[PDB]
């Protein structure tokens, strides 16, 4: 048993971490004070859930988690909310003023003055780890903290923990719920500085979550709470293999092994089904075939793009609920005949399948209905490069006028970092094009 430390950075990181850890606690039967009755090994263990929770002598199960924001208001709500007892104070770290939606203010100015405190607190968790395998880092692309402080932190983690795996859950920027006009700048900057420090990144585009909430949850104007319960469902689906008995994706190195052949193209697309409103009176429960088939509708992707005009490098199917292999194989067999699924020549056409028989846990009073079976597909398609194109385009429009650049330069950043980052992204986009056309 090998431990996992989750790091939540900025507003989007912290609020999503709240949602995930609430889910986790529901799933493992951990109460809000941190007590798990089914845990007969009191005070310790090397169980599967222990990769995410440590135990105290008093039978308290405590998330291997650090929350870090450069201003206090959001983590203060953790400190005073339902799961206050769950987290030990030293793990909730706040600053005095945020990064003002400014990557360079989070990376350089305010980052430099809190990076060492954060690393010390992270070391205090690592030191409680018999065999730490690495880090799950949650953050937005668009926030000033979310981008700038996160990239600084990733650089340092690579130095203080060089053999350890680092995974990203990254919120991609969408106008409908965005908070700043400079989010493309920050997105590109943080992607470029973090690219070589991340082994596998799951990008979630707020545009997709927003439309999924509207279409399938009949939520007219989704909030962050709606978005985050849905995203936490997806995240839980992705991590369940680190927290439960199984043979698929059991350590972080296996995510890279199974999902990232070329190290630079490490952005797997996540597709999730079914998403059913709790207010649906009569729901006909969907079959393995129906939900597996939904895995290939763009409208269920965490990022809107068209995998038909790309190539696959890998594909993993994670089921939860009443699923057995032969039904999965049947579903796949018919899907292959009816759908455009092209793998790259140097890769097998196939699917690694993971099934956990416990169906998804849903937040009592939430928006999602309980269901008998659900699936998250993780596929490394080149089609996700569409999302980089969009982003890079929005950058190129602004940067051609050097609009807003003075705010970055005034923080100590040099104009050249902009064009450097953009050049890296042009590389990335070309790598995708060459792998997939």
């Amino acid at each position: 048993m090998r431990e996992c430390i989750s790091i939540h950075v900025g507003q989007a990181g912290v609020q999503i971490g709240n949602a995930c850890w609430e889910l986790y606690c529901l799933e493992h039967g951990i109460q809000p004070d941190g007590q798990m009755p089914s845990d007969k090994t009191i005070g310790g263990g090397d169980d599967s859930f222990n990769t995410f929770f440590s135990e105290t002598g008093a039978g308290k199960h405590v998330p291997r988690a650090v929350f870090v924001d450069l201003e206090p208001t959001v983590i203060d709500e953790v400190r005073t909310g339902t799961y206050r007892q769950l987290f030990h104070p030293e793990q909730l770290i706040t600053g005095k003023e945020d990064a003002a939606n400014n990557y360079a203010r989070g990376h350089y100015t305010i980052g430099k003055e809190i990076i060492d405190l954060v690393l010390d607190r992270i070391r205090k968790l690592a030191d409680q780890c018999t065999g730490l395998q690495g880090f799950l880092v949650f953050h937005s692309f668009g926030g000033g903290t979310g981008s700038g402080f996160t990239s600084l932190l990733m650089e340092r983690l690579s130095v203080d923990y060089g053999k350890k795996s680092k995974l990203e859950f990254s919120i991609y920027p969408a106008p409908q719920v965005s908070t700043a006009v400079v989010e493309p700048y920050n997105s590109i900057l943080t992607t470029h500085t973090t690219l070589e420090h991340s082994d596998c990144a799951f990008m979630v585009d707020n545009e997709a979550i927003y439309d999924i909430c509207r279409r399938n949850l009949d939520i007219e104007r989704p909030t962050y709470t709606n978005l985050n319960r849905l995203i936490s469902q997806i995240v839980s689906s992705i991590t369940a293999s680190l927290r439960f008995d199984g043979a698929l994706n059991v350590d972080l190195t296996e995510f890279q092994t199974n999902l990232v052949p070329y190290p630079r193209i490490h952005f797997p697309l996540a597709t999730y089904a079914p998403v059913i409103s709790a207010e649906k009176a009569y729901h006909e429960q969907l079959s393995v075939a129906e939900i597996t088939n939904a895995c290939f509708e763009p409208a269920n992707q965490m990022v809107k793009c068209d995998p038909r005009h790309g190539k696959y490098m890998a594909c993993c199917l994670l089921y939860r609920g009443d699923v057995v292999p032969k039904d999965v194989n049947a579903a796949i067999a018919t899907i292959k005949t009816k759908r455009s699924i092209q793998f790259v020549d140097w890769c097998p056409t196939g699917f690694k399948v993971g099934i956990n028989y416990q169906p998804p846990t849903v937040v009592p009073g939430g928006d999602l209905a309980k269901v008998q079976r659900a699936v998250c597909m993780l596929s490394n398609t080149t089609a996700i490069a569409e999302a980089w194109a969009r982003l890079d385009h929005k950058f190129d429009l602004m940067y051609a006028k050097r609009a807003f650049v003075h705010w970055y330069v005034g923080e100590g950043m040099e104009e050249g970092e902009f064009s450097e980052a953009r050049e890296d992204m042009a590389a990335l986009e070309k790598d995708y094009e060459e792998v997939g056309v």
């Binding site: 005095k96 939606n101 007219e220 104007r221 962050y224 602004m398 006028k401």
Partner: protein
């Protein structure tokens, strides 16, 4: 987090007093500073503008500055007069005679240090001061001259905080003296260099609104300031009220100001109110907010393009409808929004409406059409300056014609810079 507020001169103090009346009412605080509202949205961020004092009292974080005491006294005697701490009243005795130089170079200099003393005292009682907002006119002497002196002193002592101003611009339609263009052109030269964000409150636009649409035949300064305080409560609601967007002075700078100098904002407001019964629909609110007739800087927005826009809707209403209508405005007029700043229009919603309205909308545009305002001032300036008229009031206080020439040039540069991006 904390904002320090400074009101300087006759206009500065009259509008500042009205601002504190209005937002004190919005946050449930009474003229004695004792909270008496019902809800708790009213207090979440009450410290951004108020210090807490003994006995659960709330005391505005506000310094009152003038070179003559007539207006300041009028404030103390006025409605909310006793809510301000008396130590924050800083005044001289000789006035400034509508003379920028007296405010900036001679009389002002004599008083500015003690104002900075009060500033320092307020700021060291701050946990994380984010910066300052100043209210002042630009056509008089104390507000324009001493206020810009204050601004560059504050910038020296606090170079890493935000300087924001509400700056009332002079109009011959509402005019105290002929030297107002001189006073204004000097001040804009200061503003362009030492503020992060300025709300251009045009006394012309205020007059035209009171007259052409509020059907007031003889607008007073009261009728003008009611518009001003509506606008001020509007543009500061995302600062003092907890919402989804946790806003402050610096984020507003970062997102509104693509280039440092072009930081002069056109504010607007709807529904336009005089000192009614029909509820406005969200499509109506949205169409009015964008109407040239609802904007406090007499500029035709169709004569330029919007660089950035930020809009605030106050009231209980449909977020969905607001989203649809804002998108409709942009998609049906995209010509007037620069294409090289994607998604340059942001919207915020506050459940709490202003006093006496179930719904309302406040507009903050960084338009290149603002150049019209400065062109207006520059013309008036030149008309006099080319005959060196009325200059002796200024050279008598030590100033050189050269300084006038410099300030004129910097404003004409500001106009050219706006014209640069109107055609990009």
């Amino acid at each position: 987090r904390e904002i320090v507020h400074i009101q300087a001169g006759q206009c500065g103090n009259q509008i500042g007093a009205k601002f504190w009346e209005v937002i004190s009412d919005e946050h449930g605080i009474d003229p004695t500073g004792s909270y008496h509202g019902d809800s708790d949205l009213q207090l979440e961020r009450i410290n951004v503008y108020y210090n807490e004092a003994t006995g659960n009292k709330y005391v505005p974080r506000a310094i009152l500055v003038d070179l003559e005491p007539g207006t300041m006294d009028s404030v103390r005697s006025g409605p909310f007069g006793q809510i301000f701490r008396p130590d924050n009243f800083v005044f001289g005795q000789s006035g400034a005679g509508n003379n920028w130089a007296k405010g900036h170079y001679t009389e002002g200099a004599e008083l500015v240090d003690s104002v900075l003393d009060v500033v320092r005292k307020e700021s060291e009682s701050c946990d994380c001061l984010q910066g300052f907002q100043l209210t002042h006119s630009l056509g008089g002497g104390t507000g324009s001259g001493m206020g810009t002196l204050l601004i560059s002193k504050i910038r020296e002592e606090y170079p890493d905080r935000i300087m924001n101003t509400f700056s009332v611009m002079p109009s011959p339609k509402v005019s105290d003296t002929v030297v107002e263009p001189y006073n204004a052109t000097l001040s804009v030269h200061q503003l362009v260099e030492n503020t992060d964000e300025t709300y251009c409150i045009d006394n012309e636009a205020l007059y035209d609104i009171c007259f052409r649409t509020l059907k007031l035949t003889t607008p007073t300064y009261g009728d003008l300031n009611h518009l001003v305080s509506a606008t001020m409560s509007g543009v500061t609601t995302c600062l003092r009220f907890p919402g989804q967007l946790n806003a402050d002075l610096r984020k507003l700078a970062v997102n509104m100001v693509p280039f440092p100098r072009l930081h002069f904002f056109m504010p607007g407001f709807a529904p336009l109110t005089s000192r009614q019964y029909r509820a406005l629909t969200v499509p109506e609110l949205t169409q009015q907010m964008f109407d040239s007739k609802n904007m406090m800087a007499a500029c035709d927005p169709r004569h330029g393009r919007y660089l950035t826009v930020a809009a605030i809707f106050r009231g209980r209403m449909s977020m969905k409808e607001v989203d649809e209508q804002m998108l409709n405005v942009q998609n049906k007029n995209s010509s007037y929004f620069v294409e090289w700043i994607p998604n340059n229009v942001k919207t915020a919603v506050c459940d709490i409406p202003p006093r006496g309205l179930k719904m309302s909308a406040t507009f903050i545009g960084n338009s290149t059409a603002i150049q019209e305002l400065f062109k207006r001032i520059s013309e008036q300036f030149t008309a006099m300056f080319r005959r060196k008229a009325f200059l002796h009031w200024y050279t008598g206080e030590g100033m050189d014609e050269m300084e006038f020439t410099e300030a004129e040039s910097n404003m004409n540069d500001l106009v050219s810079e706006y014209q640069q991006y109107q055609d990009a």
